[PDB]
Symmetry: C2
Subunit: 306 residues, 2 copies
């Protein structure tokens, strides 16, 4: 039995934050405890949204409830989008304390910054969260999934090539996490300009061996919300099943991603009128219908070892 504490947004309709992470982890066999950092009607890709936010004091009370009952034993912690630095600082305190009674606990973190759509009713992540991610979060995180933009902010460097990316990833390793994945970048894939390139690095174990990989997936003709949340949740699951093989973990995670996205776009175009661009409501991830692909994804991508 593996127990995950996931602290992310909750939307009534659709998939983002905890909605995008819970179902996948459950069908894969993980026990998921979900703290909903906010509760909104839907994500920010729609024209309207309403809801309420949970403050750091409220998050503390919920955790204390678990502590008072002596049920605060976790194997994993999972976090993502946050637009509140005080909330984030509270998350760090909770993780450190959890790692105290279980030094084997793995903290998976997606350090979201910028203007990514989300389920917390925000248009942007405050610039002041950067120092908190750099100095408090990353140092205690074991697996991080920054996109290029985020990897550059965290290291103060700019990536202009594949070589600089590996250097940036090494710096991230020195900051703390043994597994780093740059989920997307603007690096032109040598396979074509329509493929999105992803890079992965894993320090295993006197000399620590580093396993580096690169992957490429063809872009999809649409804008989706919650894909970063789904990606991190499935990577958690597969790295747990393949602890020393980042290659297989990523191939399964990226393949699953492909199956869900393809089914989603196909359904969206079928529900929209002819020659009409699908709306955000029509583009919600087809989560429930992709159950089998999530459980056992047909491999459609091959990672090359660098």
């Amino acid at each position: 039995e593996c127990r995950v504490l996931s602290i992310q947004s909750h939307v009534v309709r659709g998939y983002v934050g905890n909605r995008a992470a819970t179902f996948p982890l459950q069908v894969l066999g993980f026990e998921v405890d979900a703290v909903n950092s906010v509760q909104f009607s839907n994500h920010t890709g729609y024209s309207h949204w309403k809801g309420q936010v949970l403050n750091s004091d409220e998050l503390q009370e919920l955790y204390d409830g678990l502590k008072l009952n002596h049920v605060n034993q976790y194997d994993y912690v999972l976090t993502g989008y946050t637009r509140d630095k005080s909330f984030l600082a509270m998350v760090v305190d909770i993780v450190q304390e959890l790692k105290q009674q279980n030094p084997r606990l793995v903290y998976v973190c997606d350090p979201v910054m910028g203007d990514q759509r989300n389920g917390e009713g925000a248009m942007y992540v405050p610039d002041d969260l950067l120092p908190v991610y750099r100095e408090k979060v990353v140092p205690v995180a074991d697996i991080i999934t920054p996109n290029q933009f985020e990897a550059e902010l965290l290291t103060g460097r700019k990536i202009h090539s594949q070589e600089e990316a590996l250097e940036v990833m090494d710096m991230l390793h020195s900051m703390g996490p043994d597994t780093v994945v740059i989920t997307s970048s603007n690096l032109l894939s040598p396979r074509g300009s329509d493929y999105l390139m992803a890079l992965g690095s894993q320090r295993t174990r006197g000399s620590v061996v580093t396993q580096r990989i690169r992957m490429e997936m063809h872009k999809v003709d649409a804008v989706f919300v919650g894909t970063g949340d789904l990606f991190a949740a499935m990577l958690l699951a597969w790295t747990h099943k393949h602890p020393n093989n980042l290659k297989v973990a990523c191939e399964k995670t990226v393949s699953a991603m492909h199956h869900v996205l393809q089914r989603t776009i196909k359904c969206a175009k079928a529900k929209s009128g002819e020659g009409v661009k699908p709306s955000p409501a029509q583009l919600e991830l087809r989560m429930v219908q992709s159950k089998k692909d999530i459980e056992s994804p047909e491999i459609v991508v091959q990672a090359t070892v660098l």
Copy 2:
């Protein structure tokens, strides 16, 4: 695609309310939209619990959000434990508006009253709720799943035998719902004292004005332990199986109750193993083994037969 609006409690750890209802419906293939009426660390069966509650205004804000985006189209609405009358009344306004939008919408309601353990940090359900359930909720509900106590309160009549239970179910049908399932009762089952007896009734009105009523009885062997969230899990699976078997309450209930049996057997086996020999499992150890029961929820092997009355 069948879309369900489920308005129930949320707990960080464990299974009760929306936590007990969501996963099962999703694995059965339903699109579940979940409004969390509260958010607590765990259910009220533990010695401690902390959390926040939503008032009726906050429920209205969330629904207005769906309405403003024109995505307030549902096939089902599902509610359970509710501790405040204002919230319950708001739920009724929502159901009525959605039924205007879709006349085929089915409202599944578990009218929890009394002192049932919950995820809403309540010790008891206020009496001021009974009037609302009788006059506002039940009349717009299509499927209701009260226990014996709740059926008696709703109709104002006590049940002393199987026959009276059927009369009470007929009274509930007259109040509104075409499908009524009394989930548990204090009635002595033919099979033996170690069996739990549940009764179901589905009323269908024919074109010529005649009425056909399917009445069934089900007996499940008891499990010696106190579980929480079983009523929520029951209502959610009943919703899925009646959808697949719209005119066959017998098959819908056999599948639902059978799935319950598989989930509870796996749960009690794991609880006893964790507590050790001679020690009674604690509420933390008795949390439903939801995730591990995926296959049994998806296609439960039939272990109980409904007797047609």
